[PDB]
Amino acid sequence: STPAITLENPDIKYPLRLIDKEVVNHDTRRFRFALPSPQHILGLPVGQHIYLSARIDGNLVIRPYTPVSSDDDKGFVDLVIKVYFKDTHPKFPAGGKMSQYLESMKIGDTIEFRGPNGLLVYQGKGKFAIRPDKKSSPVIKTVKSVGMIAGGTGITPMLQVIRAIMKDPDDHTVCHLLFANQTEKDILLRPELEELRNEHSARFKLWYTVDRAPEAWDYSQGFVNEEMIRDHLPPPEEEPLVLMCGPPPMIQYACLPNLERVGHPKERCFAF
Template identity: 60%
Template sequence: MGNNSSLVIGAGALAVIGGFLIFKLFNSSKSVKSSKKVALVDSNIKYPFELVLKDELTHDTRRFRFALPSPEHSLGLPIGQHIYLSARINGDMVVRPYTPTTSDDDKGYFDLVIKVYKAGIHPKFPDGGKMSQYLDKMQIGDKIDVRGPNGRLKYQGNGVFSIGIDKSSTNVKQIKRGTGITPMYQLIKEICKHPEDQTKVQLIFANQSEHDILLRDELEELKQNYSDKFDLWFTIDKSVQSDWKYDIGFVNEDMIAKHLPPPGDETIILMCGPPPMIKFACNPNLDKLGYTNEMRFSY
């Protein structure tokens, strides 16, 4: 991707990247020796990390901070990839993917911002979220097993994404729903903090209500501080506030056309969210607007 690349993020995440070059890149990266201390040395091994901080961000959202082996260690997670947390819960081994909100620039710890889905709240999920409730009950000093890095997508910097293949993109669009924002948030921060990276990011972030918007303050601060690189748009199913200045309703053709750049050879659309949203809200409307399958990637 060139110096004037654009990234669009929305209620879901889409990204399309080539295969041969990325495969070559992944293999070569493993053969390079580095003096950097990373905690995730082998993606096939589970590493236990200790909970050292737990913040209540909202009534159902927590920030969990886990310590790395030393203050000099970074997690060792490329931008765009995720980790797996595993725990034995009520006799069953439960494994869930998460993306930290921190990056490898943060030493000695990593943070996870997670929405806790409690039992008895949603009729379709009477038991709630097994892993999120487990994490919420953890005490300072408890440990959780972590494995990674995992995932097909890597952000190489300067607008270059790789997924089985390398592809340069001047426009990246992301569509997110609910807690699918964390992979995008990490990517947006990475692009914004590097002045030499001229990639432009546009995000549509869909939620049920204002209260469900994860990392809203952080996202709006990024928009304010990096308005030349990052644009942000929310949509919610319903609003109870008269001063709501964004959209109300599901992601649709008009919303995508208005808040994401047009399709093109250097456009990548990243989608992260519930499969029904991607299948019925994102892909049909992207089809109508002329975005090819090669311009899309779903986490």
């Protein structure tokens, strides 16, 4: 038999109860929400995400999240969240709406989840099903390697796919991640990524870039560029699938132009 799923219908909102909040570091949290019973699973295909929705300061706010849990977890869903506090970044004085709302929640408060959503589903052993849109059907793309470019919060769609691959010992797909952040301090999920590298280096390649680097830095500095894509993603000759998730100036200026310069087919590069 299979566990009961939580996300039965994508147009229903499921208010889930907050049961634990971990302060990972000053501005990073892990929020654990209870599913309807301890024996439920979320019901989120690999490749897809959920949305959170709430009335925040009187207005509707909806945002996508990819849990760090999986359908192997019974009874709960975990979200890792970067909190964007007001009065910290000069270009974003108000901070972030949903992330500050999450930070304000009390244990026992609920928030609405909906899903699953997204045009890409990983079907295992290198096979991806990618819709060109929500009523069109998908392209069952099969690849030997996956190039992944994440910026900031865009890591969690990548991590979900990486973990699904690594846990299947008969999945020979190789994932190459290039992960960009503002600073070293601002990197999400570094221990988790480095554990995967420790255990699965043959199938998981890891590289970081930071906009500004610390004194002691072993990786790259600057925005994603042509050289980083040549050096840290599979070559286009091997026809990898290229996945991206990051702030829309990152995708537009740093990722797509440079993927094209290396020779990857731009129009095949998928943005979560």
